[PDB]
Amino acid sequence: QALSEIETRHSEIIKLENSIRELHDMFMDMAMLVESQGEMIDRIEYNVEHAVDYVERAVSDTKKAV
Amino acid sequence: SEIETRHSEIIKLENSIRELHDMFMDMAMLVESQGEMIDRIEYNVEHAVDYVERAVSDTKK
Amino acid sequence: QALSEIETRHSEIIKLENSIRELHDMFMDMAMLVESQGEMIDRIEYNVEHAVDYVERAVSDTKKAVK
Amino acid sequence: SEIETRHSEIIKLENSIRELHDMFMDMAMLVESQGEMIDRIEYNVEHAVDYVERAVSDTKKA
């Protein structure tokens, strides 16, 4: 009924495993948030990139009318 | 005793895991905080884009 | 030769692109280190799991000796 | 005037960019602490695995 020494060891290691495994949900939550933030930044860079192209075209066009 | 040693090892390792779990919480909060700063930056940038595009259009181009 | 106004607006928006790219690069480095941390945790989980299966087997064999 | 508002916006943009940069410095620090805590956990887990498997074998042989 009570645990033997070998069973006690086993229980301890199983407890450690579940605990390492359960770190998953929290890590995935953080990871998702970090990944989402990266894309936000990337969209901002994308729009600025578009602004630079728009202006570069206008600058190149205007010079033509010179 | 050897038993005490093994027990302190299990408790420390346990606190460490819980602690890591908390750093992840702190990270999440830090990311949400940066998310407001990014919204502020995007607002500034969108206006900056507007400014240069208007100024470059009115100057016929 | 001094920059015209249009050229100045161009320079300004270009700087802005380089600035945002830098912010983006700093963030992506950290993001890669975080991804890497998750993989390490997976490996650890994988090793403890394999250890658990090992102990299980031994607990079974130690009990089967009882006969 | 236009200078006042214009200059004001050039400063707001630069300030918000530097502030995020600063926040990124704090993030980097937490990323480092996370990694180190994980290094430590890898060590403790390697030890616990070795310990229990050793004990498990001595019991099967005794």
UniProtKB/Swiss-Prot annotation, chain D:
Tissue note: Expressed predominantly in cerebral cortex, hippocampus, cerebellum, adrenal medulla and retina with weak expression detected in non-neuronal tissues.
Glycyl lysine isopeptide (Lys-Gly) (interchain with G-Cter in SUMO), cross-linked positions: K60, K61
Subcellular location: Cytoplasmic vesicle, Secretory vesicle, Synaptic vesicle membrane; Cell membrane; Synapse, Synaptosome
Residue span, t-SNARE coiled-coil homology domain: 1-62
UniProt-annotated site: (Microbial infection) Cleavage, residues: K61, A62
UniProt modification remark: Phosphorylated by CK2.
Cysteines joined through disulfide linkages: none
Subunit and interaction comment: Part of the SNARE core complex containing SNAP25, VAMP2 and STX1A; this complex constitutes the basic catalytic machinery of the complex neurotransmitter release apparatus. The SNARE complex interacts with CPLX1. Interacts with STXBP1. The interaction with STXBP1 promotes assembly of the SNARE complex. Interacts (via C-terminus) with KCNB1 (via C-terminus); the interaction increases in a calcium-dependent manner and induces a pore-independent enhancement of exocytosis in neuroendocrine cells, chromaffin cells, pancreatic beta cells and from the soma of dorsal root ganglia (DRG) neurons.
Family, similarity comment: Belongs to the syntaxin family.
Function of the protein: Plays an essential role in hormone and neurotransmitter calcium-dependent exocytosis and endocytosis. Part of the SNARE (Soluble NSF Attachment Receptor) complex composed of SNAP25, STX1A and VAMP2 which mediates the fusion of synaptic vesicles with the presynaptic plasma membrane. STX1A and SNAP25 are localized on the plasma membrane while VAMP2 resides in synaptic vesicles. The pairing of the three SNAREs from the N-terminal SNARE motifs to the C-terminal anchors leads to the formation of the SNARE complex, which brings membranes into close proximity and results in final fusion.
Protein's name according to its UniProt entry: Syntaxin-1A
Positions spanned in the full protein: 193 to 254 of 288
